[PDB]
Amino acid sequence: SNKYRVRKNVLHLTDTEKRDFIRAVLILKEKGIYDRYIAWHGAAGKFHTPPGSDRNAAHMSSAFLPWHREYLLRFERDLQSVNPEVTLPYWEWETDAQLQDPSQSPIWSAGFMGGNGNPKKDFIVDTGPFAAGRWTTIDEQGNPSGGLKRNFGATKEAPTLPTRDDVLNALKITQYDTPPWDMTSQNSFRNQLEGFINGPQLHNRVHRWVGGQMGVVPTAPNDPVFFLHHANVDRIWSVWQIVHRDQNYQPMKNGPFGQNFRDPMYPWNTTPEDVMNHRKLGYVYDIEL
C-alpha cells in the first residue's frame, strides 16, 4: 500500500521532485541511455505485423498499450538508477484542456518541459532544459538534427487537447480490442484511447496538438513530454482495467504475430501477459490510493 512506486500528476509534484526528474532525464541523455528509447520507438514504428500491413509492434494494433507500458517501465528503471527517489509523472492533458490557454499550464514552465515553439525561430523550443543547444535531437534516420520543435494546436485536425468527456466515453467501452486488431477496430478501448475513432482523438490528438518531433512517429520521444503523455495513457488504461474486471487483453490467439497475449513485442521478448498487472510491475498511479 506504500511499498509501491507512486506515479504522480506532474501538477502535484514539489519544486524538488520536478527538479530531480529533469536532472535524471538530462543525466540519461548525457550517458547515452535516453537515445536507446528514441530508437526502440522508431524501430518498433517500422516493424509491421505482418509485413505489408499498416499495423506495427508499438502502434495501430492491440500491442499499442502493453508495448508503451513496457517502454515506460524500462525508462523508469533507468531514471531510478540515476535517482531512486524519482518515479515517472503523468501529464493529465484532459484537465489542461479546461484552460483558456493550455500553454499557461505549469508543465510548460522554464523549470519543467519549457514552452511552445518560438515562431520567429521556425518553432524551435528556446525555453526550459530541452531548448535547442541544451538538448540534442535525432532525425528519422538516427543522425543529429536542429533541436526540439513544438507548435501547440497549429493543425486544423487537432486544435484542441482531449477533454475529460473524451476519456470517460473511452472508459465505458466494454472490450479491450476487436478484429481486425488495427486502426479500423470498432467498439475498441485500445483503438479509441490510441485515438483512431473519428481521429485524431485522445492519444494521437495529444501528439498532433504538441506538433514538432512529438507530431510524427519516427521522432516523438525526442520530447521528454512523450513519457508524461504516455504515463497518462498508461494510467487511463489501468483505470479501464479496474472498471472492467471481467475483461482481459485481446487477441489471446489468431491475431498477427506480436499482437497475441503470449507473443513477444519487438524490439523485446516482453509479452502483453508480462505487463497486464501494473501492480506486479511494482508501481501505482497516485489516485489509486
> What is the phi/psi pair of residue 266, to 5°?
-45, 130
Cross-strand bridge partners of residue 48: 56
Q: Is 213 in the site for a copy of itself (CB under 8 A)?
A: no
Among 8, 10, 40, 189, binds a copy of itself (CB under 8 A): 40
| 3 state SS for 48-98 | ECCCCCCCECCCCCCCHHHHHHHHHHHHHHHHHHHCCCCCCCECCHHHHCC
Q: Is 158 in the site for Zn ion (CB under 5 A)?
A: no
Question: Closest CB to a copy of itself among 97 and 265?
Answer: 265
Among 19, 47, 118, 273, binds a copy of itself (CB under 8 A): 47
CA angle 179, 183, 185 (to 5 degrees): 30
**Under a CB-based contact definition with an 8 Å cutoff, are residues 87 and 8 in contact?**
yes
Cross-strand bridge partners of residue 283: 5
Cell of 36: 536507446
Is 207 marked as binding a ligand?
yes
Candidates 44-52, 81-89, 200-208, 236-244: pick the segment binding a copy of itself (CB under 8 A): 44-52
- Using CA atoms, how far apart are residues 208 and 200, in angstroms rounded to an integer? 8
x/- string (CB under 5 A) for Zn ion, residues 48-87? ----------------------------------------
Q: Is 46 in the site for a copy of itself (CB under 8 A)?
A: yes
H-assigned helices in 123-181: 164-171
Which residues in the 168-227 window bind Zn ion by CB under 5 A? 174
**CA neighbours closer than 13 Å in the CB half-sphere of residue 139:** 5
Question: Closest CB to a copy of itself among 199 and 267?
Answer: 267
Radius of gyration over every alpha carbon of the chain, rounded to an integer in angstroms: 18
Q: Is 286 in the site for Zn ion (CB under 5 A)?
A: yes
Among 1, 2, 16, 32, binds a copy of itself (CB under 8 A): 32
Is 286 marked as binding a ligand?
yes
The minimum distance between CB 214 and Zn ion, in angstroms, equals: 9
Question: Closest CB to a copy of itself among 71 and 90?
Answer: 71
Is 59 marked as binding a ligand?
yes
Which residues in the 95-134 window bind Zn ion by CB under 5 A? 122
> Which does residue 258 bind out of Zn ion, a copy of itself, none, counting CB within 5 to 8 angstroms by kind?
a copy of itself
**Under a CB-based contact definition with an 8 Å cutoff, are residues 288 and 238 in contact?**
yes
Q: Is 1 in the site for a copy of itself (CB under 8 A)?
A: no
Among 267, 273, 287, 288, binds a copy of itself (CB under 8 A): 267
Residue 124 DSSP SS3: strand
- Hey, what amino acid is at 119? P
**Under a CB-based contact definition with an 8 Å cutoff, are residues 194 and 64 in contact?**
yes
- For residue 139, CA distances in Å to 35, 213, 217 come to 11, 9, 11
Chain residues that interact with a copy of itself, rule: CB under 8 A? 31-33, 35-36, 39-40, 42-43, 46-52, 136, 138, 141-144, 256-258, 264, 266-267
Annotated binding site for Zn(2+): 12, 41, 48, 59, 94, 122, 143, 203, 207, 230, 244, 274, 286
Chain residues that interact with Zn ion, rule: CB under 5 A? 8-9, 12, 46, 94, 122, 142-143, 167, 174, 244, 246, 271, 274, 286
